[PDB]
Symmetry: none
Subunit: 413 residues, 2 copies
């Protein structure tokens, strides 16, 4: 179905991501978008709408031109990172250079990345408008603007208007949103030219929990959960590189097998980490949203949102890392008091209510390691020259003392 | 000189040993010198210092030849001479049998100042014209008594014939049997004679080549050394030994010549810090390693001469040393004993089961240490209910999982 007029540099980055047949949103919007028409894609994730706009953007970029040629606006750092990561991969062969721009990061680190002359900017409105006022972001060669998850950017409206004021009047504009509230309509009328609407009609396999916890408490609740649930393979999502690094390190110092992945790592390093995770050489991948989509690993049984993803679309992709191929998944999201609203908004958007889970106490965690060791132990005997050594050992110490000591060692990480 | 003094002071050198206080002033006067001293007296620096001091680094010709009985000694000596001339930037190249000659022919293009080599391989290069000795004005015959034992006399004499007649000659040997005297008498000019008159448990195992690796790992399982060095004869055997050890779950890394500054330093950092349990090494790590806490040395390949052996095992005991000896190497093993005057105890190669029991014994000692040192109140009840679903059965299962 991906038999459109697509180049080979694109068709080949696309197959490496496993893209075979097109979804409706892609089937319908890509031709119009390749004809350079303004497009409004009404569809939820994950109908493939991200690739629906990512492909035409990479297709129309000239990698020889060192200017920013496309701008994608996203509501949150989480979505900016996920979308950039997907566009990056779409434009890897052609060597299209994508740079995420968002809040909460050192703006200097962003000035620095800008010098490398990215082709596609995907960013947050407040932060984009920020770089704009300082001349570090120059948008005179932008001829493609995408507004993505636009209903989430409905404050933002004023920044979006100011951003568009700096972009050439002559340009292709694309807007993607699950719902179309009339302020979206207003955007379309004023900034888009003859837009074509493409609407697609809107898994219970993932169990979804949240926990209300203070920041200072998150780490111990995490390790306690890990002690109780002992996941085969888990992903812990965090908000920043630093938090992901510190989290992986803290876990490793507690004896868990964990590694961090984020945007500052080289392609070489991230592939190495993903290999280690895939093969289960580590039990726990700690990650930013750079690892929320298209991982091609099927054994993840638990996802922990150490830091709540701010927008529903990023949330959905994060938890969908588990529950792959019909098998049951567990998703747990840590919510600070001030984030309860964001959590409720996520629930109303997915139409799936989450179950509140009580944070485990240290005692419950301890009892948990005990229950797991005891049961692994019973299985050993049940299903499979150890006895004489047991005899000689029991010859000089009480059997309770011996087994107690065995359990202490067994339960240790 | 200054650049020499820095390099040796930064090496630890401060006070001279007798062989050094007596030989060096004569050597620096360009005299022929016969150092009769066994190893461990600093005889190597005794000849390495003057060579380095005598080299003109701006001359790209071979200016000094050191002849040595074995590849192991050639490497060890190269490694010490290199360090001695690190600051002055003196280029040293080792040259020995068993290695592809074409790689040596390559290296010979890069203009070494000093060759350290074995006699058969040196004359090979002489005959081919790949080694040019027209500018050699210092020749050292090192561990000369071992070179005569190994039947190298015609090669050594042939070598002397291509070296300029105008040259300094130094001869170092522990003993001076008549063939060495005669060589000194025939080939040296007014030679000065300088004569100079441990808590490591030494073992050997008689093991067939094909069985060496399994014996090595069984030993590792039993002894579980905190920090071990395993010496191998060639780069290739060292890398393969390192690889095969890793595949078996041991934390090991290989070290040898032709690595890189960063790889060599990381391997040495991991070893010094205990990030790996076993360093696998050619003789490049026999001297000047400067790493503390090595409890075990395994000679996977027997070192052919006693001086190389002594410096390999001296890596520990700063200890246990184990040398694998194939049946055809049994004579060499005894030659080493007579030369060092310490008999080695013969250890029986462990069996598969003895290796298992050793692992068992270790898990038990950890368990018993817990019993003796730790409060186990928290686990008592869980243990009592476990002892419901017999005593022997439970422990045996526990032991099963305590050993992966």
């Amino acid at each position: 179905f991906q038999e459109l007029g697509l180049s080979q540099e694109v068709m080949k980055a696309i197959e490496r991501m496993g893209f075979e047949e097109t979804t409706p949103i892609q089937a319908k919007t890509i031709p119009l978008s390749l004809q350079n028409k303004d497009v409004i894609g009404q569809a939820q994730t994950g109908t493939g709408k991200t690739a629906a706009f990512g492909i035409p953007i990479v297709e129309k970029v000239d990698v020889k031109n060192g200017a920013i040629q496309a701008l994608v606006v996203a509501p949150t750092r989480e979505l900016a990172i996920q979308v950039s990561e997907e566009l990056y991969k779409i434009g890897a062969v052609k060597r299209v250079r994508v740079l995420p721009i968002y809040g909460g990061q050192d703006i200097e680190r962003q000035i620095r990345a800008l010098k490398k002359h990215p082709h596609v900017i995907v960013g947050t409105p407040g932060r984009i408008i920020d770089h704009i006022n300082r001349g570090t972001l120059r948008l005179e060669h932008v001829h493609t603007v995408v507004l993505d998850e636009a209903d989430e950017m409905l404050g933002f409206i004023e920044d979006i208007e100011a951003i568009l004021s700096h972009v050439p009047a002559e340009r292709q504009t694309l807007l993607f949103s699950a719902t179309m509230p009339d302020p979206i309509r207003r955007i379309a009328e004023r900034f888009m030219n003859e837009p074509e609407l493409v609407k697609v009609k809107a898994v219970p396999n993932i169990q979804q929990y949240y926990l209300e916890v203070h920041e200072k408490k998150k780490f111990d609740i995490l390790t306690r959960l890990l002690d109780i649930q002992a996941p085969e393979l888990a992903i812990v999502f965090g908000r920043t590189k630093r938090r992901v690094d510190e989290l992986a390190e803290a876990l490793n110092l507690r004896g868990y097998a964990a590694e961090g992945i984020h945007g500052d790592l080289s392609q070489a390093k991230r592939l190495s980490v993903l290999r280690k995770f895939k093969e289960g050489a580590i039990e726990i991948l700690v990650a930013t949203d750079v690892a929320a989509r298209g991982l091609d690993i099927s054994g993840v049984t638990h996802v922990y949102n150490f830091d709540i993803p701010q927008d529903p679309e990023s949330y959905v992709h994060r938890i969908g890392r588990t529950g792959r191929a019909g098998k049951t998944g567990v998703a747990m999201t840590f919510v600070t008091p001030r984030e309860i609203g964001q959590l409720h908004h996520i629930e109303r958007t997915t139409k799936r209510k989450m179950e509140r889970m009580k944070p485990p106490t240290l005692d419950e965690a301890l009892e948990g390691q005990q229950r797991i060791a005891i049961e692994k132990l019973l299985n050993v005997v049940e299903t499979e020259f150890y006895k004489r050594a047991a005899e000689e050992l029991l010859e000089e110490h009480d059997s309770v003392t011996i087994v107690a000591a065995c359990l202490k060692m067994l339960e240790h990480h």
